[PDB]
Design a protein around this motif. Structure first.
Motif: not given
Lengths: 352, 337, 231, 220, 34, 51
Positions: B54, B56, B72, B75, B77, B96, B98, B114-116, B185, B226-227, B311, B329
């Motif tokens: 996917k 992202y 996801q 990598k 590119i 992960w 985003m 996701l690793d902050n 988000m 809200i995304n 998606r 995705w």
């Protein structure tokens, strides 16, 4: 024997009769060589004659009112029958598989395209389905070509060779379907890309092996006609591997149905309906109907067993592609979603 | 405590009353007598392959020809979309991811998830290899968005209900932005790099001054998370996309919602949003595997970008307005024009 | 970034020799490599080229068939095998690194060469072989090509190198318009189809040597005669 | 094209080859999402993101623990290991509501949950002690009795079995309230010492894959 | 046996015997005229 | 705390606001200003389009 052999034998007899003449008076009547009411046994070189009787002459007495010799051939022709019963059964069986392979061919052509035009439906499952759907169509087309050449030289021996090959492939890609589903249910997280190589080589290559053996033996030991006539025990080099495909698929069918019965029990007419539905939809893929008459020997065409076999198999062998193309392509949930998603995309195009 | 709550409620009522009177008319009834866009039909001029999972995030470069894509598969590119070539293949430490960003100079790219941690990668350097330059740590939740301000300043938003500004050379937080209740988000930097808006799961949007560090405005017009958030090219407004399956155009100098984009058949949430060069076409990417071209002025689906099997996750535009890019995705990035 | 070259020596005519270029300081595996020689007193001459992954190789018709170019990426080395040496093969040999992708600068780094002594093509020429200059002045050096170096992709393939006495050539401007790294901004380049100029404003010391202009549109890679600047 | 563009295309082809190689290497692994709460042994099942990798029967599993958006990330995952604590009864309803929310999660309609009930030893000890009664927190417990023919135990207490089966029934009939058969809840018991957990997860993942295959074939 | 093959083998033998009977039938007619 | 909330709400309330009509007019004016330079709205000639 054959027509050509009989013509040769009659010519040999004519020459032999001439030799006897050189060595009433004897004469040649195009069938018999009468000696010098005279009764002669029915000739032994006429295949369809009755050899238990004789032809009566009169010493030679001419036909009253005519200048032709008189003879009685009634006894020798006792067994000759102008009966079209056997041919009518053959023609009816020709109509059954022509219709069934026609609908089976038509539906699988659509089925192959759908699994190809949708890159979404590109997995080791649909790839195997694609090859099976192609084997069904090639087998149907082979019968049409073999029929159009045999019934209508090296030219007609190619049609028979493709017939025995593209037929054998279909029985072997039906086996791959069952073997794939077997491993897909009995092998834990089994590799799929690796097996796709073996299935394609086994589904097209192995049928060529013992068919190429048929061509070699026919061309070296029985090179006569279009190879469309049984030459003794040579037919078993092609049929026996095909008959093995049927038995093995049946064995796999029982296991799948057996396990599916365990699951529905370890989760009551509401349970029996489910097992019945699973068994029926899984039968066309496995060619379960083939097991009934797989062991039927070569029997008389007028016999009852022969009549049941041909009317049965010519109906369910020819219509099998129709059932496989619906249960597994058109009844697949993912396939239907793609059609609906594709229709929605085209519908959005109409929204312009 | 009770007095404080009463005063807070009184001030909220005062804010609502003040912003209710200013709404003399509505953008909907102001933009009725104009020329509708019509049909925005776009074709996939290029389709990028090489991402095996996917997609992202994706961000254009400053030259409208180099673009980073984060998927996801783990990598980053860099694509030359002109010749569909792969300029670089950047392996990420964490799969992960985003969000991703392209430095305005082009020397650096950013990726977060996701690793902050917002990782910075130096692209243009000797030795002919892209190498990690700086790792920004300090956020508590997952990173939702990140955008460069210059070669040394980057703004990020996290799932801990905060946004931050960073100094890359020192790798330190220069300002922390607080006030959001839910997870943040999306964030869009202003064209002048002086303000930025952020939307969160609390169904509100907040405008922040990059220097001072205070919340100049707060907007509430959604009834769900809200995304995605995107600044208008003018910089005096923005657009938000929510799980409500609706977009909403907000202003800054009026301090209240202006427009809402929704359709009855549209029940999927909005995954991404972006603006064309003119800002006339708010392009949104949904979960129904397609993108909609909403006329931001009229709020109508003047076009659809329907070529994605899964998606649509990311959706951006070039700096020259010549092409749009969509990542979904289905693991395919597509340049449409 | 270092490209140290070994080989050379005295050779009898008709023999063979192996030249080596050991690279240290960059991603050798991602860099293409080139060989360029220089006669005892003449200009520069391209020799060979090997692409990344050894998937594309080119030679020069002048030495094609007798030279071979190879590379050991794990060993980070470049090899040039010589065969049937001729009296015109006496020169100083150089190895050059060049990576190819959008916005990249090929021929970025040259190296110190090795001396070898033995006992059609696009054409660009430099009219001036000597041009006296004075410190603090502006010098414009132009060199024109046979055809248009502009391509459908919009790139004008002209490269400028400076060879100071007792030193290897160093790149100044690539693709006729883009500066390099480590070169002072005083150097610049410009031009249009077939008309290419290089400007130096506020000329200073340490900027004395021979200027060479090269093209890369299509092989073989041809060099100019060389414009020498003297105080 | 120019020689520069040819070299660029060659570099792009090498990059494509590398990407294909990496994908081929990474395709085989099975992913898993670990959900739960505190005091539940969530992170104590197997021995940003605390990803863990473990292999069983030549099958590799990548478990991911995060720390409800972002659940979208784990949309194509093999299974969700949802650990719950069934020793403290006050938050048992909180765990039931969390299970309901995760089970009805829109993104997770097709993801089968390997539900884990941890620290059953503490629950058994509490049942023996009698200090706390589940009926005080779930009145229907008072009107509950263990099934006659469905109680396979190693010689444990009928009270403990009855309480465990009551909690399992609550969770299971929450799972089957509306599932449509597209995914299943697999309940299990863990006592923080039972090392036969990877085997349970492997069997349940095999069952999930098998069910997906049968649904593709319409056999079930 | 494979029914599709058997039908071809039986149909061929049927036609082979029919042509032989047609030939002999004609050959008998010549005897009548002789 | 509630003190910070009330302070922030007061700061947000004591700001300059203009009627939404003028903001809508500004957005339309900017769309028209950049209207004639967006190929995503009016397709550019195939020779000028890079893709």
């Amino acid at each position: 024997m054959t027509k050509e052999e009989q013509i040769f034998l009659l010519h040999r007899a004519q020459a032999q009769c001439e030799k006897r003449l050189k060595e009433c008076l004897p004469e040649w009547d195009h069938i018999l060589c009468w000696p010098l009411v005279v009764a002669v046994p029915c000739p032994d070189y006429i295949y369809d004659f009755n050899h238990k009787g004789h032809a009566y002459r009169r010493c030679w007495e001419l036909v009253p009112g005519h200048n032709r010799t008189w003879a009685n051939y009634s006894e020798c022709v006792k067994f000759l029958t102008n009966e079209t019963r056997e041919r009518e059964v053959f023609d009816r069986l020709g109509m059954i598989y022509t219709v069934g392979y026609s609908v089976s061919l038509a539906s699988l052509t659509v089925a192959v395209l759908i699994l190809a035009y949708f890159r979404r439906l590109h997995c080791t499952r649909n790839y195997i389905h694609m090859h099976l759907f192609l084997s069904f169509m090639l087998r149907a087309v082979s019968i049409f070509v073999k029929d159009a050449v045999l019934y209508s030289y090296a030219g007609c021996r190619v049609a028979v060779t493709f017939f025995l090959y593209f037929l054998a492939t279909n029985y072997y890609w039906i086996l791959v379907e069952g073997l794939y589903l077997h491993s897909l249910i009995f092998m834990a997280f089994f590799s799929e890309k690796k097996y796709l190589w073996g299935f394609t080589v086994f589904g097209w290559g192995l049928p060529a092996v013992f068919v190429a053996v048929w061509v070699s033996v026919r061309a070296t030991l029985a090179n006569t006609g279009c190879w469309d006539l049984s030459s003794g025990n040579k037919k078993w080099i092609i049929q026996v591997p095909i008959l093995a495909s049927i038995v093995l698929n049946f064995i796999l069918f029982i296991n799948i149905v057996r396990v599916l019965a365990t699951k529905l029990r370890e989760t009551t007419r509401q349970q029996y309906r489910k097992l019945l539905k699973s068994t029926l939809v899984l039968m066309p893929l496995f060619g379960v109907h083939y097991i009934v008459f797989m062991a039927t020997p070569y029997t008389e065409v007028s016999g009852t067993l022969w009549q049941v076999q041909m009317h049965y198999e010519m109906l369910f062998n020819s219509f099998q592609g129709f059932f496989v193309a619906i249960i597994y392509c058109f009844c697949n949930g993912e396939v239907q979603a793609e059609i609906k998603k594709s229709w929605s995309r085209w519908t959005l195009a109409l929204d312009f | 405590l009770d007095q404080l709550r009463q005063e807070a409620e009184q001030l909220k009522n005062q804010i609502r009353d003040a912003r209710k009177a200013c709404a003399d008319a509505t953008l909907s009834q102001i933009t009725n007598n104009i020329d509708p866009v019509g049909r925005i039909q776009m074709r996939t001029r290029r389709t990028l392959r090489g991402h095996l999972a996917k997609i992202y995030a994706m961000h254009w470069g400053t030259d409208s020809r180099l673009l980073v894509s984060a998927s996801q598969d783990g990598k980053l590119i860099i694509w030359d979309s002109y010749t569909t070539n792969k300029v670089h293949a950047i392996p990420l430490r964490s799969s992960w991811v985003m969000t991703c960003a392209y430095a305005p100079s082009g020397n650096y790219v950013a990726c977060g998830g996701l690793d902050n941690i917002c990782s910075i990668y130096n692209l243009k350097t000797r030795e002919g290899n892209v190498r990690v330059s700086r790792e920004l740590a300090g956020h508590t939740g997952y990173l939702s968005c990140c955008r460069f301000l210059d070669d040394n300043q980057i703004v990020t938003s996290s799932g801990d209900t905060t946004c931050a500004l960073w100094d890359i050379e020192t790798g330190q937080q220069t300002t922390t932005f607080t006030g959001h209740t839910g997870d943040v988000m999306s964030l869009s930097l202003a064209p002048d790099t002086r303000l930025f808006v952020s939307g969160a799961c609390d169904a509100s949007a907040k405008l922040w001054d990059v220097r001072e560090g205070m919340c100049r405005q707060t907007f509430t017009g959604h009834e769900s998370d809200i995304n995605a958030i995107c600044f208008f090219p003018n910089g005096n407004a923005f657009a938000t996309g929510s799980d409500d399956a609706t977009c909403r155009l907000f202003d800054l100098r009026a301090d209240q919602e202006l427009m809402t984009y929704s359709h009855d058949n549209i029940i999927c949430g909005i995954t991404s949003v972006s603006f064309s060069k003119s800002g006339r076409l708010l392009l949104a990417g949904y979960d129904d595997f397609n993108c909609n071209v909403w006329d931001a002025l009229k709020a109508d689906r003047a076009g659809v970008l329907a070529g994605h099997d899964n998606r649509v996750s990311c959706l951006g535009v070039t700096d020259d307005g010549m092409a749009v890019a969509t990542g979904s995705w289905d693991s395919f990035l597509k340049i449409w024009n | 970034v270092q490209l140290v070259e070994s080989g050379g020596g005295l050779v009898q005519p008709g023999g063979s020799r192996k030249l080596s270029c050991s690279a240290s300081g960059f991603a050798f595996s991602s860099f293409g490599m080139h060989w360029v020689r220089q006669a005892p007193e003449k200009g520069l001459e391209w020799v060979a080229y090997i692409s990344s992954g050894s998937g594309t190789i080119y030679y020069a018709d002048t030495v094609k068939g007798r030279f071979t170019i190879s590379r050991d990426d794990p060993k980070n080395t470049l090899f040039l095998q010589m065969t049937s040496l001729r009296s015109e093969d006496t020169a100083m040999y150089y190895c050059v690194r060049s990576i190819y992708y959008y916005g990249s600068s090929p021929f970025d780094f040259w190296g110190q060469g090795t001396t070898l002594t033995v006992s059609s093509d696009i054409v660009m020429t430099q009219a001036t072989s000597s041009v006296p200059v004075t410190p603090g002045e502006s010098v414009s050096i132009s060199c024109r090509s046979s055809k248009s170096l502009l391509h459908s992709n919009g790139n004008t393939y002209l490269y400028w190198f400076l060879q100071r006495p007792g030193q290897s050539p160093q790149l100044l401007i690539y693709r006729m318009s883009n500066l390099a790294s480590g070169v002072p901004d005083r150097f610049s380049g410009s031009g249009s189809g077939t008309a290419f100029t290089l400007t130096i404003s506020r000329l200073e010391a340490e900027d004395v040597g021979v200027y060479y202009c090269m093209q890369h549109l299509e092989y073989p890679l041809t060099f100019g005669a060389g414009t020498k600047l003297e105080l | 094209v120019s020689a520069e563009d040819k070299a660029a295309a060659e570099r792009s082809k090498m990059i494509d080859k590398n990407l294909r190689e990496d994908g081929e290497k990474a395709r085989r692994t099975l992913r898993l999402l670990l959900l739960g709460a505190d005091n539940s042994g969530k992170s104590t099942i197997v021995k940003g993101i605390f990803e863990t990798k473990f292999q069983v029967d030549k099958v590799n599993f990548h478990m991911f623990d995060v720390g409800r958006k972002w659940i979208q990330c784990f949309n194509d995952v093999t299974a969700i290991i949802f650990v719950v604590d069934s020793s403290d009864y006050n938050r048992l309803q909180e765990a039931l509501n969390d299970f309901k929310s995760i089970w009805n999660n829109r993104w997770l309609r097709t993801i089968s949950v390997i539900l884990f009930l941890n620290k059953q030893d503490l629950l058994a000890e509490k049942v023996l002690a009698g200090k706390s009664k589940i009926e005080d927190y779930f009145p229907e417990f008072a009107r509950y009795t263990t099934p006659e023919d469905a109680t396979p135990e190693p010689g444990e207490d009928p009270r403990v079995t009855r309480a465990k089966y009551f909690i399992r029934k609550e969770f299971v009939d929450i799972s089957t309230a509306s599932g449509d058969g597209r995914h299943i809840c697999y309940p299990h018991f863990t006592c923080a010492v039972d090392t036969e957990n990877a085997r349970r997860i492997f069997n349940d993942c095999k069952d999930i894959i098998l069910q997906m295959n049968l649904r593709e074939y319409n056999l079930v | 046996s494979v029914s599709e093959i058997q039908l071809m083998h039986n149909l061929g033998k049927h036609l082979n015997s029919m042509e032989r009977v047609e030939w002999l039938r004609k050959k008998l007619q010549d005897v009548h005229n002789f | 705390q509630a003190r910070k909330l009330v302070e922030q709400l007061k700061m947000e309330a004591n700001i300059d606001r203009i009627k939404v009509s003028k903001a809508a007019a500004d957005l339309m004016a900017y769309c028209e200003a950049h209207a004639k330079e967006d190929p995503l709205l009016t397709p550019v000639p195939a020779s000028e389009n890079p893709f």
